[PDB]
Write an enzyme that holds these catalytic residues in place. Structure first.
Site, PDB file in Angstrom:
ATOM      1  N   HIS A  49       9.566   5.413   5.219  1.00 32.21           N
ATOM      2  CA  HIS A  49       9.066   6.021   6.443  1.00 32.21           C
ATOM      3  C   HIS A  49       8.415   4.977   7.332  1.00 32.21           C
ATOM      4  O   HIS A  49       7.875   3.974   6.853  1.00 32.21           O
ATOM      5  CB  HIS A  49       8.075   7.153   6.161  1.00 32.21           C
ATOM      6  CG  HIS A  49       6.928   6.759   5.289  1.00 32.21           C
ATOM      7  ND1 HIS A  49       7.045   6.631   3.920  1.00 32.21           N
ATOM      8  CD2 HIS A  49       5.635   6.483   5.585  1.00 32.21           C
ATOM      9  CE1 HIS A  49       5.872   6.298   3.412  1.00 32.21           C
ATOM     10  NE2 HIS A  49       5.000   6.201   4.401  1.00 32.21           N
ATOM     11  N   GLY A  53       0.779  -1.223   0.000  1.00 31.24           N
ATOM     12  CA  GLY A  53       0.000   0.000   0.000  1.00 31.24           C
ATOM     13  C   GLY A  53       0.812   1.275   0.000  1.00 31.24           C
ATOM     14  O   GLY A  53       0.265   2.341   0.303  1.00 31.24           O
TER      15      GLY A  53
HETATM   16  N1  LIG Z   1       2.098  16.504   3.823  1.00 33.09           N
HETATM   17  C1  LIG Z   1       1.947  15.446   4.652  1.00 33.09           C
HETATM   18  N2  LIG Z   1       2.048  15.577   5.993  1.00 33.09           N
HETATM   19  C2  LIG Z   1       1.894  14.524   6.823  1.00 33.09           C
HETATM   20  N3  LIG Z   1       1.625  13.273   6.396  1.00 33.09           N
HETATM   21  C3  LIG Z   1       1.501  13.005   5.076  1.00 33.09           C
HETATM   22  C4  LIG Z   1       1.652  14.100   4.106  1.00 33.09           C
HETATM   23  N4  LIG Z   1       1.481  13.553   2.884  1.00 33.09           N
HETATM   24  C5  LIG Z   1       1.234  12.229   3.058  1.00 33.09           C
HETATM   25  N5  LIG Z   1       1.247  11.905   4.365  1.00 33.09           N
HETATM   26  C6  LIG Z   1       1.012  10.570   4.925  1.00 33.09           C
HETATM   27  O1  LIG Z   1       2.053   9.725   4.495  1.00 33.09           O
HETATM   28  C7  LIG Z   1       1.559   8.365   4.360  1.00 33.09           C
HETATM   29  C8  LIG Z   1       1.983   7.823   3.015  1.00 33.09           C
HETATM   30  O2  LIG Z   1       1.405   6.547   2.746  1.00 33.09           O
HETATM   31  P1  LIG Z   1       2.302   5.229   2.708  1.00 33.09           P
HETATM   32  O3  LIG Z   1       3.384   5.549   1.711  1.00 33.09           O
HETATM   33  O4  LIG Z   1       1.345   4.144   2.269  1.00 33.09           O
HETATM   34  O5  LIG Z   1       2.800   5.071   4.123  1.00 33.09           O
HETATM   35  C9  LIG Z   1       0.046   8.421   4.594  1.00 33.09           C
HETATM   36  O6  LIG Z   1      -0.259   7.962   5.915  1.00 33.09           O
HETATM   37  C10 LIG Z   1      -0.280   9.911   4.446  1.00 33.09           C
HETATM   38  O7  LIG Z   1      -1.405  10.354   5.175  1.00 33.09           O
END
Ligand SMILES: Nc1ncnc2c1ncn2[C@@H]1O[C@H](COP(=O)(O)O)[C@@H](O)[C@H]1O
Lengths: 113, 115
Positions: free
Chosen positions: B101, B94
């Protein structure tokens, strides 16, 4: 390495579906798999939970993730996977010996529990 | 260029705001804008690694640092009943942001399976 069932597995006192071993960790399939591929990477050092890990455990914890990455590739997981560490009651931690879950072979969903 | 070319690169370079919990020379922890639990934050390296499957052996200490920072931040945020750490890799994981991260989620009972 410890007073849990994972200690018994490390000491080879009970069988497990071992994938990989080195001097500091052990990878084996989860006995209650939640995906077509679901395995664990555990340190041989008995760290009861991630919340009590020490700063000097930093490279060992990263080693669990690198081993998990390499095991996943050699279990055929080229479409991706999810890594999980559970802490305590709210985290659903099942054994009080730090363990990294690696799950794949199906679409993993959101939220992650 | 430092921090990569994803949205997380913009966060690392402070071009767009984020609610930062902790920063050091190696990583940044900040709250997720789409929280899946009462507490939901991310720990990311400042070095751009696109996904955990391409991390190098030399990245081992950095990856462990993310987990150590994650558990220290969880304690500082009051998650004394526990939490879950998650890394999403690729399509089946996903993954949506291709910059490594670690999710840290808590403040409610997490369920099994983890997605
Ligand atoms: N500008 C942002 N600030 C904080 N969280 C973010 C931002 N953009 C994306 N995310 C989060 O980063 C994660 C990316 O998804 P994943 O790569 O599947 O972990 C998701 O939980 C998003 O809500």
């Amino acid at each position: 390495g410890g007073d849990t069932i994972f200690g018994k597995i490390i000491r080879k006192e009970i069988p497990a579906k071992i994938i990989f071993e080195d001097d500091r960790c052990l990878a084996f399939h989860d006995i209650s798999p939640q995906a077509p591929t679901h395995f664990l990477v555990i340190p041989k050092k008995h760290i009861s939970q991630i919340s009590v890990a020490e700063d000097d455990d930093e490279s060992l914890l990263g080693h669990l993730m690198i081993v998990g990455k390499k095991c996943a590739a050699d279990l055929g997981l080229n479409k991706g996977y999810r890594m999980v560490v559970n802490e305590g009651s709210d985290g659903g931690q099942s054994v009080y010996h730090v363990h990294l879950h690696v799950l794949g072979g199906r679409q993993m969903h959101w939220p992650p529990g």
